[PDB]
Design an enzyme around this catalytic site. Structure first.
Site, PDB file in Angstrom:
ATOM      1  N   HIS A 137       0.850  -1.211   0.000  1.00 37.67           N
ATOM      2  CA  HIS A 137       0.000   0.000   0.000  1.00 37.67           C
ATOM      3  C   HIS A 137       0.870   1.239   0.000  1.00 37.67           C
ATOM      4  CE1 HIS A 137      -4.092   1.703   1.319  1.00 37.67           C
ATOM      5  NE2 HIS A 137      -3.380   2.684   0.747  1.00 37.67           N
ATOM      6  N   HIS A 139       1.850   4.889  -1.667  1.00 38.22           N
ATOM      7  CA  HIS A 139       1.581   6.060  -2.524  1.00 38.22           C
ATOM      8  C   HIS A 139       2.935   6.621  -2.966  1.00 38.22           C
ATOM      9  CE1 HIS A 139      -2.806   6.436  -1.566  1.00 38.22           C
ATOM     10  NE2 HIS A 139      -2.386   5.605  -0.591  1.00 38.22           N
ATOM     11  N   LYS A 220      -6.006  -0.677  -8.410  1.00 38.80           N
ATOM     12  CA  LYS A 220      -6.576  -0.150  -7.181  1.00 38.80           C
ATOM     13  C   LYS A 220      -7.946   0.432  -7.473  1.00 38.80           C
ATOM     14  CE  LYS A 220      -6.912   1.764  -2.965  1.00 38.80           C
ATOM     15  NZ  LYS A 220      -5.869   2.713  -2.575  1.00 38.80           N
ATOM     16  N   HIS A 222     -10.614   2.738  -5.644  1.00 38.76           N
ATOM     17  CA  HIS A 222     -10.634   3.745  -4.560  1.00 38.76           C
ATOM     18  C   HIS A 222     -11.937   4.528  -4.628  1.00 38.76           C
ATOM     19  CE1 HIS A 222      -9.479   6.867  -1.807  1.00 38.76           C
ATOM     20  NE2 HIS A 222      -8.337   6.199  -1.558  1.00 38.76           N
ATOM     21  N   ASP A 224     -12.421   7.545  -4.026  1.00 39.44           N
ATOM     22  CA  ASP A 224     -12.242   8.902  -4.582  1.00 39.44           C
ATOM     23  C   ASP A 224     -12.373   8.893  -6.109  1.00 39.44           C
ATOM     24  OD1 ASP A 224     -11.747   9.530  -1.914  1.00 39.44           O
ATOM     25  OD2 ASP A 224      -9.817  10.500  -2.325  1.00 39.44           O
ATOM     26  N   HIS A 249     -10.285   0.070  -1.729  1.00 34.78           N
ATOM     27  CA  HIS A 249     -10.719   1.060  -0.729  1.00 34.78           C
ATOM     28  C   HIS A 249     -12.166   1.356  -1.070  1.00 34.78           C
ATOM     29  CE1 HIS A 249      -9.980   5.275   1.300  1.00 34.78           C
ATOM     30  NE2 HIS A 249     -11.302   5.166   0.981  1.00 34.78           N
ATOM     31  N   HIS A 275      -6.528  -1.470   4.321  1.00 34.66           N
ATOM     32  CA  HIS A 275      -6.917  -0.859   5.622  1.00 34.66           C
ATOM     33  C   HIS A 275      -8.286  -1.387   6.054  1.00 34.66           C
ATOM     34  CE1 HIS A 275      -8.766   1.876   2.754  1.00 34.66           C
ATOM     35  NE2 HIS A 275      -7.567   2.457   2.457  1.00 34.66           N
ATOM     36  N   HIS A 323      -9.522  16.136   4.814  1.00 34.74           N
ATOM     37  CA  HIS A 323     -10.794  16.223   4.058  1.00 34.74           C
ATOM     38  C   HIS A 323     -11.333  17.653   4.084  1.00 34.74           C
ATOM     39  CE1 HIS A 323     -11.822  11.902   3.099  1.00 34.74           C
ATOM     40  NE2 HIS A 323     -10.586  11.879   3.618  1.00 34.74           N
ATOM     41  N   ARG A 339     -16.232   7.155  10.958  1.00 32.59           N
ATOM     42  CA  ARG A 339     -15.041   6.572  10.292  1.00 32.59           C
ATOM     43  C   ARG A 339     -13.935   6.229  11.301  1.00 32.59           C
ATOM     44  NH1 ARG A 339     -11.889   8.245   4.632  1.00 32.59           N
ATOM     45  NH2 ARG A 339      -9.827   7.585   5.352  1.00 32.59           N
ATOM     46  N   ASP A 363       0.424   2.505   3.760  1.00 30.04           N
ATOM     47  CA  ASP A 363      -0.344   3.683   3.288  1.00 30.04           C
ATOM     48  C   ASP A 363       0.581   4.894   3.239  1.00 30.04           C
ATOM     49  OD1 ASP A 363      -2.574   4.923   2.154  1.00 30.04           O
ATOM     50  OD2 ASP A 363      -3.967   4.202   3.748  1.00 30.04           O
ATOM     51  N   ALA A 366      -0.068   8.912   2.493  1.00 30.84           N
ATOM     52  CA  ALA A 366      -1.507   9.213   2.272  1.00 30.84           C
ATOM     53  C   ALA A 366      -2.260   9.150   3.598  1.00 30.84           C
ATOM     54  CB  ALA A 366      -2.126   8.298   1.252  1.00 30.84           C
TER      55      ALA A 366
HETATM   56 NI    NI Z   1      -7.406   3.991   1.172  1.00 27.99          NI
HETATM   57 NI    NI Z   2      -3.863   4.672   0.503  1.00 29.25          NI
HETATM   58  O   LIG Z   3      -5.538   4.697   1.793  1.00 28.71           O
END
Ligand code: NI
Ligand code: NI
Ligand SMILES: [O-]
Ligand code: NI
Ligand code: NI
Ligand SMILES: [O-]
Lengths: 570, 100, 122, 570, 100, 100
Positions: A137, A139, A220, A222, A224, A249, A275, A323, A339, A363, A366
């Site tokens: 994981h 980034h 991946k 995600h 988003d 994700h 995660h 966020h 969350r 991760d 990120a």
């Molecule tokens: Ni994620």
């Molecule tokens: Ni991530």
């Molecule tokens: O993530």
């Protein structure tokens, strides 16, 4: 002639029945077996065993059962065992685990572990040796992240990104053929193994599949980019054709579905759930229930590992800042509270201990720390010993069962999940020589030496102007394996079968070793070493309490951890 | 200044020592890298002062005691080594078991 | 409960080196005027010419000392050492070029040792 | 028009009869001759001589006797002389030493030293210019060691190692074909000339020779691999066939023989005796007697250079720490006392002064300092002037004889010993343009500019953000010669004739200049410039006193050295 | 902080100056790089204070005297140059013959 | 010492904070990078002291006030973030609107 056990361990490292403390934890590993012949141990230096006509053979050419490198007297910690052996490397691969030296005069020499004119020596006596960590994981945001990872014993980075672009800052995605080609070329300069994930989003197969043909090693999904039923389905249809893994994700917002809708879209196909506790992302509040299913390969990311008194305050604020959430907008506060949940973070510690979460990961940059996957694995195991006691499976007062369960989470299990365990992820004959030496006092904290493809890539070493290498300042430094064209031979770019068949390496001028991703679609939870438990995980939608076999999983957060302020300058 | 690579690196040791000394002054028990930095900087400043290698092998054992550092730190540090420019050129100092 | 990071807790007992191999004690004299130190795994008949001992008793043997250690002979020093048997194939190549094959060829090893002035060929 | 001598030297650098102090030593060098024509000196800048139609020729194309680079007004210090000249470079080589400019209008222009449109200018007025240092005892342990070496004027590293592996930490050895191939590829990224030594150990020829065919430039015999009569013999048989040099670190322990046994195994063949004094290794206590023999090319390593009041305390402890020796084990103390000897270290200063030890070297990161070979050469020469007086050979009150004897030890003599003096090691027409500019106040301490293959590789230079390059902080920095593909054209990989004939460079994709090792086996002590003395050296086995021509060689250790605390921040 | 390359490098000058000032405070005669560091940091702190280039060309000649430094150091230092951000932007200061 | 990359970088923050604190002590209004360095070093020293993330989120708002910094600096700094090793491992601290 007899040697007492204290003197023996000080000279050769520990032998059968001896225990070693892991750093400043309460975890003890015990030597299960030893491949040596007492009196014929290999060692190097003035008047020592590995000399011509003695423990070094002076007859055989390199091709004739001679090693390029012998690691002497290693204490191996691996999913396969905790044991004492010499490790023989040749052509960048582990070729022998056993007893090295000279069959002329020594008993018990493994036949392909001859020390000859061609052999370099690394003394591993008093060291713990593990496989390089496999971080799935990652980034790709800041190239300075590679040395951070090497310093904590990570040798493979799987993930995505193009640098500090918003898509990459949020998601492990290198999108489309052109960005994938550009990042495969960038990878020529990164002194670590790499595999690149494409964007697992689309409603037509061709836009997704063209990423795999361009040289992606996986996908991946995600939220988003829209973690919709369609994107999930198309990505898994591509993955099943291409033999690559899909990471997910999921839709935290439950916008197009709840967890049961995501599982229906997956439709029993193999998937890597990132995660899985959900602080890092996923269906609120019950995503961690994924870790019960037989077609799910579940990982944690590291900032929830383990549950501490600062975890919730840290995570709620991190989520609000990242966020752009406002403390005075009730929808924003409700989202954050849905969350970041102490109930699921505390249960995540226990699900790791029970072998229900199979993997760790970072991760990196990120929502996770590039250099703390190994660190936080052992802090979790130590916390669970202190709160839950020795596991029932232990004997001799050792923590060997727990140590094999936890080492598997960042070595072999990620490698199996990604389809790369034929090359990396364990200390086994026939695998690439990615090896990490640890002083036990620094175990899981700061690597001594990181070997990549049989050459040291990274080391804690001192003043380059000094008479000897140990004077201050001792710091992590890139070694000759990273320099010039040797960076090509010491590191693997993992790619899809289709990109390899289509000649992408030659098209882009890639000089790195090319690894093939394969055997990703046939596996399941049962294939996760020491972490193969399937069960019905219930997450109460009102209280967020987690139940397994009718029992609430809860534990307290700790105020202090080992592998922390004793070691770090900041 | 004409700094060479070693001069550039060894500034870091002095800085880490200053950081550690401020932590000690506000009452903290020092950790592994803090303790190493303090004793290392002491050796390099001693060479600058014109002490002998033998004087610094002695003095380096009395810079920090057990009650200055966290549990286990004395047993983590088997020896501290530094090279510095003495009046008679660069020499290596090794301080054995600096914290009893 | 004081924690020494990375400490050992060794098991009870002792490690017997070179177990099951024949042991031999011999007297050895450094007839030279400079010190001689001999490692654990050198074929004993092939050590420095100025060490005086029954060279036949060094054939197929090495010091019975822990792997990687050495015996020291100061100038003029005579002392007893314990030998153990070589294992594996019981062949020696190189070193002083006295053997270059099986250690079983005692007559050939001693003829070479005597021609080159290795003291103690009897 | 006449210019007084102070004003002349300030504008153009010194001329015939002028003396310059070397740093803060008591050593003075005198200009022996000057190639200029007074009034037609070359210089560059506003209203200066090297302008079109004036001192720069505007007619000739590059091929027509024009230079790529002119170093103006250099004070050359070389085994060939101490003299004033312009130095002309073309195609990366020194093509002219003499007088540069424009034959249109200037008298005395060397015909192939035309300044034309194609010519760059380096002002060397007021600088001392030497050949780049040739370090023949390098352990490749930490890549940060390369800048350390460049900062003290070293341009060639000969030795071995794979990084901080125990074999490499002890021995200048890159063992076997695979480790040699890997390190030749690593070398593509090192901004310095390199030659790699294989393991000089074996009882069969083939395991040793296959290293030479793989691309090694020589061999190292080291006691830690067994410095046995067999290993010595086979290594010299290989070297005699392959035309490469053998370095030796002999059997300190006298285990298989005394010095006379090692000399019998050598059997009159050429060999390079490393750290011949013996603190760095060799037959206890008498190894330094090697330096009397006509087939021995003898070098010192630098930590014994010169004998100081801290030397013995420093060396005894260094040896005990590095060999894991115990102060309470009498065999360990006896060994250390047999190896670290004030009697042989004091005699080593004098044997350097008498021309009986021909070479210096570092022993970088094994028992020596990568950046102090040049430094300690001049500190030794200064100590010997202060203790023994001007040598009988001096005239005019200058130290020119001593300066040529000592500069030879780290320039031309190592190059001759290694078989590379056709390419490097001196400022002569037809050799590679590896040149070091020194401000006299920093001579032998910190290089101003290091030129590699006719391009600046390393420089003491200031703030890169400033209006001009001199503002603080002024520090050693890699220059454009190290960047991109220019690192290939500015540096030489030295290899065996056989590896070159067998196409190893093309096989491995090496892009560096390839230098051929040759004419190594025909030479002896008589071929060492200014350092060609053979004599019977007697080392008393009871007292360790050294005698030459019936006279005990002894001197006192000094409390202070020049080139030390005036210059260094640590 | 948004440090650019020059800001990152120039922290080293301040650090070397602090090291040198501690050496001077315990009674040592300063060497070449020590003296350069002290005068350089003085110039950059002066710019930060809002002094003029002309004020710093004057003051930089009075920061260290002959008796603060080792033999030969005054004659080794022909001038010290620093660029720093004045109230009116980056300017170059050259201090000529700073130590008489 | 066994410094990792983050430990090596974060020494710079402490150094910049020491520089800024000397500027503040001689009466200067601090600029953007000075203010950021002081508050950042405060957070990392607080973690070393064993404070909680919540304590440092509070305290970091009271380290510098408006009258310690130049015009506009308070409005340039929306938040300062640092990671440091607490007794319970690395944690992220964000100080919101540190200078009112
Ligand atoms: Ni994620
Ligand atoms: Ni991530
Ligand atoms: O993530
Ligand atoms: Ni040596
Ligand atoms: Ni060496
Ligand atoms: O050596």
């Amino acid at each position: 002639m007899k040697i007492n056990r204290q003197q023996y361990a000080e000279s050769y490292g520990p032998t059968v029945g001896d225990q070693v403390r892991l750093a400043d934890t309460d975890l003890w590993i015990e030597v299960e077996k030893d491949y040596t012949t007492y009196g014929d141990e290999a060692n190097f230096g003035g008047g020592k065993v590995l000399r011509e006509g003695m423990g070094e053979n002076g007859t055989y050419t390199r091709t004739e059962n001679v090693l390029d490198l012998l690691l002497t007297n290693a204490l191996i910690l691996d999913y396969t065992g905790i044991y004492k052996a010499d490790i023989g490397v040749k052509d960048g691969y582990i070729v022998g685990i056993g007893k090295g030296g000279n069959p002329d005069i020594m008993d018990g020499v493994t036949p392909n572990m001859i020390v000859g004119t061609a052999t370099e020596v690394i003394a591993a006596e008093g060291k713990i040796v593990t496989a390089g960590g496999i971080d799935t994981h990652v980034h790709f945001i800041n190239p300075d992240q590679v040395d951070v990872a090497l310093a904590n014993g990570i040798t493979t980075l799987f993930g995505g990104g193009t640098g500090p672009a918003e898509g990459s800052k949020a998601t492990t995605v290198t999108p489309g053929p052109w960005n994938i080609e550009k990042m495969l070329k960038s990878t020529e300069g990164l002194p670590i193994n790499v595999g690149i994930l494409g964007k697992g989003h689309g409603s037509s197969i061709a836009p997704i599949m063209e990423q795999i043909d361009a040289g992606a090693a996986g996908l991946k999904i995600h939220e988003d980019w829209g973690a919709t039923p369609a994107s999930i389905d198309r990505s898994l249809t591509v993955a099943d054709e291409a033999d690559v893994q899909v990471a997910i994700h999921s839709d935290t917002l439950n916008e197009a579905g709840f967890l049961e809708d995501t599982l229906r879209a997956i439709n029993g196909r193999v998937i890597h759930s990132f995660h899985v506790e959900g602080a890092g992302g996923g269906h609120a509040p019950d995503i961690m229930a994924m870790a019960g299913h037989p077609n799910v390969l579940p990982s944690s990311t590291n900032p929830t590992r383990p549950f501490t008194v600062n975890t919730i305050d840290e995570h709620l604020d991190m989520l609000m800042v990242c966020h752009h959430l406002k403390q005075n907008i009730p929808e924003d506060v409700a989202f954050a509270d849905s969350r970041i949940r102490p109930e699921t973070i505390a249960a995540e510690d226990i699900l790791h201990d029970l072998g229900i979460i199979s993997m760790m990961s970072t991760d990196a940059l990120a929502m996770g720390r590039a250099g703390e996957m190994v660190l936080r694995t052992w802090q979790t195991a130590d916390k669970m010993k202190k709160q839950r006691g020795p596991l029932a499976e232990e004997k001799n007062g050792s923590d060997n069962f727990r140590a094999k369960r936890y080492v598997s989470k960042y070595t072999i299990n990620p490698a199996i999940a990604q389809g790369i365990a034929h090359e990396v992820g364990s200390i086994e004959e026939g695998k690439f020589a990615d090896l990490v030496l640890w002083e036990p006092k620094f175990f899981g904290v700061k690597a001594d030496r990181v070997i990549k493809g049989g050459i040291i890539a990274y080391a804690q070493i001192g003043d380059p102007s000094a008479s000897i290498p140990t004077p201050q300042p001792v710091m992590g430094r890139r070694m000759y394996g990273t320099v010039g064209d040797l960076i090509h031979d010491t590191n693997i770019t993992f790619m899809s079968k289709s990109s390899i068949q289509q000649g992408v390496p030659a098209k882009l001028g890639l000089k790195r070793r090319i690894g093939t991703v394969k055997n990703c679609r046939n596996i399941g939870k049962k294939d996760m070493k020491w972490n193969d438990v399937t069960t019905d995980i219930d997450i109460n939608p009102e209280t967020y309490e987690v139940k397994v076999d009718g029992e609430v999983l809860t534990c307290e957060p700790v105020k202090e951890l080992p592998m922390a302020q004793r070691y770090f300058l900041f | 200044m004409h700094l060479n690579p070693a001069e550039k690196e060894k500034l870091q040791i002095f800085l880490a020592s200053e950081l550690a000394l401020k932590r000690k002054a506000r009452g903290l028990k020092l950790n592994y890298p803090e303790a190493v930095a303090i004793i290392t900087s002491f050796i390099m400043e001693g060479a600058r002062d014109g002490k002998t290698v033998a004087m610094l092998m002695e003095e380096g054992k009395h810079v920090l005691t057990r009650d200055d550092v966290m549990e286990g730190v004395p047993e983590m540090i088997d020896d501290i080594q530094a090279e510095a420019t003495f009046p008679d050129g660069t020499k290596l100092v090794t301080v054995h078991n600096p914290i009893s | 409960n004081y924690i020494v990071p990375g400490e050992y807790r060794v098991a009870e007992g002792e490690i017997e080196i070179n177990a099951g191999r024949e042991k031999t004690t011999i007297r050895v004299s450094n007839t030279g005027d400079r010190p001689i130190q001999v490692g654990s795994h050198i074929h004993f008949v092939e050590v420095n010419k100025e060490l005086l001992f029954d060279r036949a008793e060094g054939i197929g043997r090495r010091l019975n000392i822990p792997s990687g250690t050495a015996a020291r002979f100061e100038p003029g020093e005579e002392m007893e050492v314990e030998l153990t048997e070589l294992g594996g194939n019981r062949e020696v190549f190189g070193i002083s070029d006295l053997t270059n094959g099986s250690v079983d060829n005692k007559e050939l090893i001693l003829q070479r040792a005597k021609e080159l002035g290795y003291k103690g060929v009897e």
